[PDB]
Design a protein that fits this description.
Chain C: This is DNA helicase/primase. Six copies of one chain form a homohexamer. By secondary structure, chain A is an alpha/beta fold. The first copy, chain A, has one domain: Rossmann fold (3-Layer(aba) Sandwich). In chain A, 25% of the residues lie in helices and 15% in strands. The first copy, chain A, has a seven-stranded mixed β-sheet with strand order 5-6-2-7-8-9-10, with helices on one face. Chain A has a two-stranded parallel sheet with strand order 3-4. Chain A is globular and about 65 Å long. The interface between A and B is medium-sized, with 29 and 16 residues. The complex binds thymidine-5'-triphosphate (4 copies) and magnesium ion (4 copies). The structure holds one DNA strand of 13 nucleotides.
DNA sequence: TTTTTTTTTTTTT
């Protein structure tokens, strides 16, 4: 592995020739310009502040609009609970929270409309619901060729200090030499001082839990606030708290949550 | 292993296309589609927490009030004990832990044969060639096996014979596994919650099984018999965890839901 | 068939099932786990020097003066004299080996000797399972009590798997003592700290084989170490385990009696 | 080997040690006098507050203006993310953080005018990205002979226990400074705060806030701690704090530095409290 | 066999029972645990380097004039002449080791051999100069010299658990097997929750290095806790912890040092 | 056997009580409470990190190496032979030689440094040593044994315990610390030890003005048993008023706060200050 | 395979 600084005439050049956008909020698209090859983002909100809404939305948007293979690794739930929350979200309805509508649209041929509008040419990919998880994600990257890989709910993949430190180190070091956006989700701690995360705490960088290797091997911290006690509980207040590429840490904007469609859109709110 | 998005075409329709209730802990019927055939309900706890205190309670109310024929096999003990808790539970008076009422009656034949009068109970005192006759020659429908432990490669070569048999027959084949020798913190017995991790023996005690009940109870608390049920990995309705309160009620002896 | 139709399993149970050995001190043992049973390996385990042999050799006297059974003792922790000399002043309610005058003022010696020893009850002992196997065959023992265990992974369980076989063979009421491990978190046991079943030294099968566990929690450097907590930690045959009672000492005389 | 104190008359005088001075701030160069061969220097701050570009700037300033051969072992970000800061740093711009310019400069080939102004001097050496790291540094410094070596992100190299690993390595790296006589700036991180705000948010960092062990303030020679408040109203005024200087005996504030967005070269600000 | 009855015991009580060695300094001790007894093992607990050989050679001396026993001393913590300087100067009430002026004064006053045979003029004390060899060296004092109270100094090079309770249980069995009142010195462990023992802390029965049975096969536990950085480092706290033979324990006594001589004597101290 | 009595000990005490001395410099009270380093003892040096535990040893090796003629041997393991073979030069001649290059430009040519060499090191008083532990005390025994180094100084015990592959790093300490105290007490050579002070938890750390306690010795716990004198230093980097604590002297009967010193930013000498 | 203490730091509790 002895490489001098003189083997870099045509290897820098071809490395010149851009980040995959962030739908629903262009403020994250402003002060990061997306994500690169080897990047590891971190998405977080509180323990119950909708960390499963916008990540699922972005997995939707990067496969039905942009032609990039979104190979998920969701381990909150099984496969038939995330495929349906892809389809019913995409059709702007509530799929898995109404029993008659799951029976109404199963009757009349619109089912193989709503399967084939999404899952067609191997864009979306799903994972069978932890040191073999890395081997399965590398088999996912090498065999299928997916670009964005999401992992969720870090408590299942795991003194939970050395554990989560070795976990974040192993994924950060996995993202080398491959060119893959390995987005991970992790939880916030129980707030040892202050107002709670169920009450809309101002999420600092001092709230990640298990070890401080989460705010030290990331490449972006995207923090959401689903302030349910606030007068906009249909509003995820989104924030860049860490950037290795720019350094702008602040209110990129807002995104408004919708009930019936399940979506959340860019909003035009100010305080 | 990774399975692609093409494999879920009809299976959401198959996901959008109960049976034996759990008399005792009345939230489990709400959360694991009761009991169909071919299930392996796990009753997981540490030695003393209420393995056979709870698992034999199901066989009375699924042997008599359901009418389905039941094969018990409590190989941690013998037939003389497994043919008494049935009687003392069906007759509400504590048989085994009383002295004078053992010899008061000995109307023993009546409370023997009235609850053994069907072809319900076929009790047992290599092993599966003698166990598996319960379902073919006899008609049993709930089969409950207690002990597994003393009963690299000669360990994980067991559950396939049971699971293919459950596939072929359709029997509620409830087998008890145990907890383990702990390593850090409080042990299980004080009221520790046991998630999917804390199980030795094999991973098939919480993975290859279909639905997993765990019993936990504060032993040196206000009462040692406030058990509480947990689901580890449920496949029928997916949702797992805590249903609700049971209590054993030492006056009578039913782990009844509270 | 290995399965047996339970209706055709009748008379063998009709011929089958047709309190017992009480405990002096801590009347929430016999009221709760119902005395003693043949074939048992009971445990009286607490910390080292909590007064375990202020229980385990009080019971050997109460089971030879009112219960009349044969008691084959085993104290390796001292000699036959040093375990038998306390018994006489224990019977006579006078604290013998803790005041110098009455150690030799009496010598009414054989009055106090024969009235508790002229029965052929006690059989002391100064390998050990051979010399407990003779206590059945050549001596006729009815209660066996032992005191110290830690001298005679598998070297700690292959004594307990021989003692459980000896309780299997003869059905003898047996009491056995082992010791607590050292709590590296928090305090020590000796100021009222509750013990768990992991607190047993040596290895990790001295608690499979035992049929119950009894323990004294004693605030040793406390305001008084004369109010002990009895705790059952395991019971195969009554289920209800935990805080049994609180025993005094009554320092004028010295009786572990419930209060 | 046994020695005494009389057979050194003409080799004590050989020491009778010229430094390698910093850049950007000058009070750092007051109370350190540069850096010497056999001297382990340590830079700490939070994550992202300036532990890689502020060290690579000094790797350039010690590697194109002073002719000292400089080697890197960048383990965070590999060769092809770190050359395009060097190139876009020396030219007083922001290269990778715009596609208005990387698109332009390879059309005509003025990339080949901004490129060979630096690396054709053959003073830079890399290591492409956990104990024979020493043995590869030995040839990077014995045959190639880069006269400063930089180790990036030592908390991969600790990925047994912590106390055993990092001391068993750190002793062999201070004994790599000795017996080979190279300067060595090593990068190592911070443990979490207990109470209050953190070391990226702008906490006043102390000496025993390290992580990996407490044997990082013990086998090391100079502790330099940046304090970059990014939540305060001055988000790009970094502070520099010398926490432990063995060779002189001055501790406290060095000075202040400003970070300029359009250029990338941090400038010495003249902030007053 | 080796089986014994409890009928044939009229002889071997009649030939058994047909206080003793008090402890000088803080005479609540013999008021409470009633002196030493033959065939035991005794632990002096104090802080490390805090006087675990000042309250044991005093109690080697006070059993060598008024008791006349064949008192041994076994020192591994020092040499065979500094242990003898202090015993000469101790009863003579002049702090001797700490002064060289009085070691060049009465070398030629001729009262060297006078204060030698004033209290070594008997054949009372015996000594030794440096564990399985120590098995023979603790028994030859019992057989060859006829020693009565052996004091053994060190435990941590005596350990060169299998070397730690091998000592304590075997040399507890040898005590009751030969009647010699063996007295051994212990080391407290290195605590972590807060203070050290050396600054006024109270000690519990756990605090003994090596393994755990040093509290099992020892028969009494004597305490000293001296507040080094306080009003004085000389007021030790005495606390009795374990007592198989009377039972009563607790806060025992409070001594001073009486700085001219070197003699542990008490005071009626309330606090 | 070796069980020798106490009646037949008339002559061995007689040829003993006729050492005690070898006093410190830098302050007064460090010669009160310990009366210097008694030949035989173990003396232990603790400061924080970068707090002068080879300043107050490089300075006390000279007062024992010139003003008393005692053969002093220095095993400085932090460094090499050259940085410490010259740090005594300006020590003696009252300049800061390595810490300022202008004097290093002055005294090359005219040989003032050569007379500064031949003054101190022209005699035979100082011996030095450079750098597991299976040969450390083996190569330290020849200094007192053959060469007669009457004081030996050991620097940085933490880099003879961090250089071994063992099971634990505690047993490997206290299987060597016994050889250290035995080699000290047996031949009666003073052997001084440098060891460090571990992580604190709340408030000020040791380098910010923490009153260090005896249980804070990093590495093991028999460093407060097999020691005869423990010395601890404190400062707040008044960034030079270093005060001294003596933790435990096994010979005499008083320990505590020893004295105040101040370090000289021109010459190199610890002036005992006032406060 | 598992037992028993004894140092040194990390989250969280
Ligand atoms: C239970 C109790 C005992 N004691 C005293 C009476 C006896 O002197 C002594 C009883 O302890 P023992 O039972 O005699 O101790 P042991 O020989 O069993 O030791 P080990 O546990 O290590 O095997 O304590 C009290 O003073 N108050 C009490 O409440
Ligand atoms: C010092 C400083 C840097 N920056 C920017 C410049 C770079 O784009 C980025 C620095 O990133 P890096 O230097 O690459 O990373 P790091 O060493 O600080 O952190 P880690 O230990 O996790 O590897 O931050 C600011 O915006 N303001 C500042 O004051
Ligand atoms: C106990 C005590 C000791 N001292 C002084 C004078 C004593 O000679 C000295 C104690 O010396 P030692 O008793 O010899 O020390 P130690 O036994 O605690 O340590 P080790 O096991 O390593 O041998 O301390 C007092 O001043 N006041 C006191 O109360
Ligand atoms: C005490 C003190 C030290 N110093 C400086 C000058 C000395 O060269 C320096 C000490 O040099 P060293 O003795 O080599 O450093 P250290 O032993 O204190 O710490 P470590 O070896 O573990 O890294 O401290 C002062 O400037 N003023 C002071 O008051
Ligand atoms: Mg006993
Ligand atoms: Mg970086
Ligand atoms: Mg001593
Ligand atoms: Mg130093």
């Amino acid at each position: 592995g002895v490489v001098s600084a003189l083997s870099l005439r045509e290897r820098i050049r071809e490395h010149l020739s851009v980040g995959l956008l962030f739908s629903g909020c262009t403020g994250i698209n402003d002060k990061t310009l997306g994500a690169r090859g080897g990047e590891v983002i971190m998405v977080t909100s509180g323990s119950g502040m909708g960390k499963s809404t916008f990540v699922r939305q972005q997995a939707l948007q990067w496969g039905t609009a942009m032609g990039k293979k979104v190979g998920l690794a969701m381990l909150q739930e099984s496969v038939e609970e995330t495929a349906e929350d892809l389809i019913g979200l995409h059709n702007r309805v509530r799929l898995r929270q109404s029993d008659s509508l799951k029976r109404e649209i199963i009757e009349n041929g619109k089912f193989d409309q709503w399967f084939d509008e999404l899952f067609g040419n191997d864009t979306f990919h799903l994972y069978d619901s932890t040191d073999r998880l890395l081997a399965k994600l590398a088999y996912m990257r090498s065999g299928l060729g997916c670009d964005v890989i999401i992992l969720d709910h870090i408590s299942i993949v795991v003194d939970e200090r050395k554990m989560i430190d070795n976990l974040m180190t192993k994924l950060k070091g996995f993202a080398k030499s491959t060119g893959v956006v390995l987005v991970v989700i992790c939880h916030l701690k129980n707030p040892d001082k202050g107002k709670a995360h169920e009450e809309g705490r101002p999420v600092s960088i001092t709230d990640l839990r298990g070890s401080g290797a989460l705010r030290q091997l990331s490449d972006t911290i995207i923090a959401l606030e689903r302030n349910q006690q606030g007068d906009m509980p249909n509003l995820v207040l989104v924030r860049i708290l860490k950037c290795r590429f720019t350094g702008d840490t602040g209110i990129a904007g807002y995104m408004e949550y919708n009930k019936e469609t399940g979506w959340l859109e860019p909003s035009s709110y100010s305080g």
